[PDB]
């Protein structure tokens, strides 16, 4: 009985790799960024980066390399997966659509061999002759590169050298030659081997083995004008080449290890280097021309340009622009300057890209006291540390709220032909019309002398020549502003009522059922121009000029009534150009034509809450993209509003949606509101850049939030945050963080920069006397953070050498107070395990932080959890329950303990508990007879756990060292005294992330069961839910069919990819389903869509809908 569902809620945001070249075309400069399973492809432009294509791989990317083989148009792409899927890819832009073709591919796994330390390295020879792979210790796999070998059959060659640190092919070699630093006792050395692929050996190298620094770790192959290698180490950098040897020991380098490099100038006269501390360096090579003897290397030099943010990834682009790919902090575009600016930096940031960093810990809070779901994360590390607040949907802040029932339309109004700020609002009601004035933040209800009030208004705008139009159902009126009078009035030849309005600024198009009349507002008179009659009754109309004319609309959008169809007309005539029959018999509700980017959009929404969208030339009228994307269930009404640069579209419904722009797509995000029926833009004298919104019975006006589907707040900390707990009754957060100080000349610690713990509004240090028994030191604190302003209210620093490891917010025993409890540990470098720590109880209740209790404890307080009125703490392989005395003292019964190392811990409101001991998941219940915990059950089958969660009483989610998820369940069968002691892996699944935190919660609420969010090292954020027999099978069905349909980049089976894989075993996946796969069903053509469907009922529509109910899960 095991059925689980898993979706991405936020795609991975950490950058794992990035590379530069010519892959879009030979005549382009691209940036290729590797997220986890994601390849992103940019064009380096002049403003910055132009996205072109974002693609999913069924595999963690581990090698990403561009190269052009002999006689080749553009660059090709080599990709090696962590599960050893190889492939070579091509960028084919054939049509107006873009594809990634698999020119070759195969799996390069070896049945033999241990995965090397320093990991998979992949490299490509300058001649493009071959691909070198270092996957396993003692083995070097060569893949020969020729026009054939579309399977990448390869061969291994024994590598005599046990333990290779880094490898590159050397430039300018009369045969592929390898260069590498390896380790044997005696330190490290650098060596060469020619690759003889002819006979599959190594031969000799083109130059002797040489010793290198103990910490040497990067090899750079310098290109042809120079040749040889650079070897970057600790405290020393050296050039090697034949008998030529150069070396420097610049002191600046001596701190932080250099982690990455990039070549700036194709001469290799200049390289960028990056630190762990994010200091960025220029490495310059000095060329010494002979006068006939060509160019030689005189010296090496390094200069500190400044500081980026900690980089996985560094890519010189064009003209002093650098992309900094960051894993532990936000990514960024950075301009390099010749002259050092203020602060003395050569580096100036142009752009910053959001990374949820490693999500180290998190929790869900209904932040602004709404039934929602805000995620708050401890993100990043060291100076990149921060909090992140993740919000779902787009919000709007309520300035004014005048209630007023039964509104049926809204139009903004301005009592001055001069400005662009309005001061009048128009509320059309069922039978009536009442106008509003605006003093500032005031709203009074008199009318305009020229406006009807006894009829219903279908339009109210501003026209031409000091004028203000009302198109009431009885007649289209015209009023002059300066001359306050009805300057003319059009009515229907036979006094029939106007049905559908339509009015830009210089043009009018009404309809009386099937009949249409095009009039004009040429000075001070309503002048008729045209008349046609429609094959059916008109449902909706829209006209707003699109570019080449300002006010004078050349085209007409129209919705009909029986053939449920939309069309494009030509207003001078009305002649029928292109018409499109939709399905069903539900009428078009609204239709609208607008301009966004390099696509002129005309879309139409139906009456059941469905929508269809269409791109179109304002030139002619061709049907473009078409996918039935449903919103609410109320007939949607469409509008245009001014925002940032680009001005967008707001869909009114019971499910308020806003339509933005993606790469060059249109974004679909929730608005965070009850139900909107009508909405207009604004610019008021008392309510500037705003929007007006009406429901069943309220009028509203305010500001609009970002743009994305998830909105993200950032709270920089400039240090490492490790743990976070929300405290409701105190309206704030406790965060444990730590910062790094250094060995002073005074001996002690200094300040490598201001951060949250050093710049807090107030502070306190530990005065405890519990203990009396050139270098880097962590210094740990407890931060108290306002849930509203996110300011660092108070910071308490723990003792010298005390690391805080665990944190909790709870009431204890009989006491009504909420104490934030912190479990610590005295940490010294020489020791393997600590023997000392404390449990401190603090109180934040008034306006400050009080140390209530201290409890000496014989080890490190790895985790803790409020049990059932007591404090369950896991101290260094022991588990002990603590009592909170009424004299405000914590105390245990020292013979009542546990032999468990609970690195991760969770509690079921019952007397239960999921731990981890000696690499396993365990289940324990409290037995008060023994004042103890009993070991109900265990998962034998070993697993290096990374996180752990209770789904319900019988099912337990785990995550592990090999990026796999699993569900353990307790046997419901006989010999309940042996087979009961064994819980069982009912579910398996290769997730491809490293999970640090699960927690019950959702970001959705204002149909399936459950909701567990999770946070990742890559910064991913997932969601997990339970299903049921039918769905799981149906969806399991849908998976296998979906595999056969979908084209996957490097020809990798989803089946292989999602299969649970460790060093020990490879099982297929069980009890799990990736929403990710199940959601890509919507991103298929109706064709391939009707394939997946052949055979309850089963249909392309019955089921399209199923998947959407699932999308609303996150």
């Amino acid at each position: 009985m095991s059925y689980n569902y898993v979706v991405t809620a936020q795609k991975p945001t950490a950058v794992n790799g990035c590379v530069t070249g010519h892959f879009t075309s030979a005549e382009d400069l691209n940036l290729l960024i590797a997220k986890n399973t994601r390849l992103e492809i940019y064009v380096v432009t002049a403003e910055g980066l132009r996205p072109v294509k974002e693609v999913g791989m069924y595999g963690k990317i581990a090698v990403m390399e561009l190269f052009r083989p002999k006689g080749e148009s553009k660059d090709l792409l080599f990709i090696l997966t962590a599960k050893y899927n190889a492939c070579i890819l091509e960028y084919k832009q054939s049509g107006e659509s873009i594809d990634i073709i698999t020119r070759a591919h195969g799996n390069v796994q070896d049945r033999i061999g241990r995965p090397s330390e320093t990991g998979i390295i992949g490299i490509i020879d300058p001649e493009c002759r071959m691909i070198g792979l270092r996957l396993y210790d003692g083995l070097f796999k060569v893949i020969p590169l020729d026009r054939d070998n579309k399977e990448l059959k390869a061969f291994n060659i024994r590598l005599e050298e046990l333990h290779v640190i880094d490898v590159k092919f050397l430039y300018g070699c009369q045969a592929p030659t390898i260069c590498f630093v390896y380790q044997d006792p005696q330190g490290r050395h650098v060596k060469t081997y020619e690759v003889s692929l002819r006979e599959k050996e190594f031969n000799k190298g083109p130059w002797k083995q040489e010793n290198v620094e103990a910490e040497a770790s990067m090899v750079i192959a310098v290109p042809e004008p120079f040749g040889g290698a650079i070897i970057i180490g600790q405290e020393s950098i050296t050039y090697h080449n034949g008998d030529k040897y150069l070396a420097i020991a610049p002191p600046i380098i001596k701190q932080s290890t250099i982690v990455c490099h990039n070549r700036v100038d194709p001469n290799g006269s200049r390289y960028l280097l990056g630190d762990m501390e994010g200091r960025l360096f220029m490495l310059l090579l000095e060329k010494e021309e002979q006068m006939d003897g060509t160019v030689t290397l005189k010296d090496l030099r390094v200069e500190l340009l400044g500081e980026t943010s900690i980089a996985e990834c560094l890519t010189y682009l064009d003209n002093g622009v650098v992309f900094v790919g960051s894993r532990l902090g936000d990514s960024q575009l950075v301009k390099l300057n010749v002259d050092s600016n203020e602060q003395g930096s050569y580096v100036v940031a142009m752009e910053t890209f959001t990374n949820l960093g490693p999500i180290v810990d998190m929790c869900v809070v209904d932040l602004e006291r709404q039934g929602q779901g805000q995620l708050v994360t401890c993100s990043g590390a060291f100076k990149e540390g921060s909090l992140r607040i993740i919000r779902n949907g787009i919000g709007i802040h309520e300035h004014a709220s005048i209630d007023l029932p039964g509104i049926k339309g809204l139009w903004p109004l301005r009592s001055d032909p001069n400005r662009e700020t309005y001061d009048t609002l128009v509320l059309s009601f069922v039978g009536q019309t009442r106008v509003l004035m605006l003093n500032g933040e005031e709203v009074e209800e008199t009318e305009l002398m020229g406006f009807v009030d006894d009829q219903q208004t279908f339009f109210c705008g501003n026209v031409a020549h000091q004028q203000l139009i009302q198109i009431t159902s009885a007649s289209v009126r015209l009023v002059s502003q300066e001359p306050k009078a009805l300057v003319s009035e059009w009515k229907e030849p036979q006094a029939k009522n106007i049905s559908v309005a339509s009015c830009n600024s210089s043009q009018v198009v009404v309809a009386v059922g099937r009949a249409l009349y095009y009039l004009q507002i040429h000075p001070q008179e309503l002048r008729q121009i045209s008349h046609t009659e429609m094959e059916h009754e008109v449902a909706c109309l829209d006209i707003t000029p699109l570019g080449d004319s300002n006010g004078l609309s050349p085209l007409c959008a129209i919705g009909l009534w029986t053939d449920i169809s939309a069309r494009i007309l030509k207003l001078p005539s009305f002649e029928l150009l292109h018409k499109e029959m939709l399905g069903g018999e539900i009428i078009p509700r609204s239709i609208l034509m607008t301009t966004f980017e390099s696509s002129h959009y005309l879309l139409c929404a139906l009456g059941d809450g469905a929508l269809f969208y269409f791109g179109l030339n304002i030139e002619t009228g061709l049907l473009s993209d078409r996918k039935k994307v449903t919103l609410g269930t109320q007939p949607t009404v469409l509008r245009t509003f001014r925002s940032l640069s680009t001005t967008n579209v707001f869909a009114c419904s019971d499910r308020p949606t806003v339509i933005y722009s993606s790469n060059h797509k249109l974004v679909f995000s929730n608005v965070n509101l009850k139900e909107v029926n009508y909405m207009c833009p604004l610019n008021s004298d008392g309510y500037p850049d705003s929007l007006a919104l009406a429901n069943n019975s309220t009028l509203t006006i305010g500001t609009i939030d970002e743009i994305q589907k998830l909105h993200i707040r950032t709270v920089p900390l400039y240090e490492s945050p490790r743990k976070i707990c929300y405290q409701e009754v105190s309206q704030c957060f406790g965060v444990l963080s730590s910062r790094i100080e250094v060995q002073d000349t005074s001996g002690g610690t200094t300040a490598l920069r201001p951060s949250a713990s050093t710049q807090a509004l107030s502070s306190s240090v530990s005065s405890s006397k519990l203990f009396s028994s050139g270098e880097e030191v962590e210094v740990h604190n407890l931060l108290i953070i306002d849930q509203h302003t996110f300011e660092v209210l108070h910071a308490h620093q723990f003792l010298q050498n005390e690391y805080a490891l665990s944190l909790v917010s709870c009431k204890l025993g009989k006491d009504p107070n909420t104490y934030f409890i912190v479990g610590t540990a005295m940490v010294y470098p020489e020791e393997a395990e600590p023997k000392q720590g404390r449990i401190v109880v603090f109180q934040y209740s008034d306006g400050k932080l009080q140390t209530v209790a201290e409890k000496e404890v014989k080890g490190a307080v790895y985790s803790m959890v409020e049990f059932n009125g007591k404090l369950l703490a896991s101290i260094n392989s022991t588990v002990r329950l603590y009592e909170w005395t009424t004299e405000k003292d914590v105390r245990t019964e020292c013979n009542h303990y546990n032999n468990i190392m609970a690195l991760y811990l969770k509690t079921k409101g019952d007397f239960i508990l999921v731990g981890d001991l000696m690499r396993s998941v365990l289940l324990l219940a409290y037995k008060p007879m023994e004042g103890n915990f009993e070991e109900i059950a265990r998962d034998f089958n070993p697993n290096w756990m990374s996180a752990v969660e209770i789904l319900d009483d019988d099912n337990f989610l785990g995550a592990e060292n090999a990026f796999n998820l699993f569900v353990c369940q307790k046997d419901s069968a006989a010999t309940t005294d042996e087979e009961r002691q064994h819980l069982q892996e009912v579910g398996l699944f290769h997730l491809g992330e490293f999970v640090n935190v699960f927690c019950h919660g959702s970001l959705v609420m204002q149909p399936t069961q459950g909701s567990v969010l999770f946070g990742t090292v890559n910064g991913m954020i997932g969601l997990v839910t339970s299903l049921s027999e039918s769905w799981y099978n149906l969806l399991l069905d849908m998976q296998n069919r979906l595999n056969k349909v979908i084209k996957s980049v490097g020809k990798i089976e989803h089946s292989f990819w999602r299969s649970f894989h460790t060093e020990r075993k490879t099982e297929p996946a069980t009890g799990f389903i990736d929403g990710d796969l199940i959601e890509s069903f919507l991103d298929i053509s109706r064709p391939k869509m009707q394939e997946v469907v052949a055979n309850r009922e089963a249909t392309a529509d019955d089921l399209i809908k199923v998947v959407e109910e699932l999308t609303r899960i996150h």
Binding site: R327, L328, P358, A381, E778, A825, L903, S946, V1017
Partner: peptide, 14 residues
């Protein structure tokens, strides 16, 4: 130390 091995692991390795 085990302790900082653990803090390293949640960062990945660093």
């Amino acid at each position: 130390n085990f302790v900082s091995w653990h803090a390293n692991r949640q960062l990945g390795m660093p």
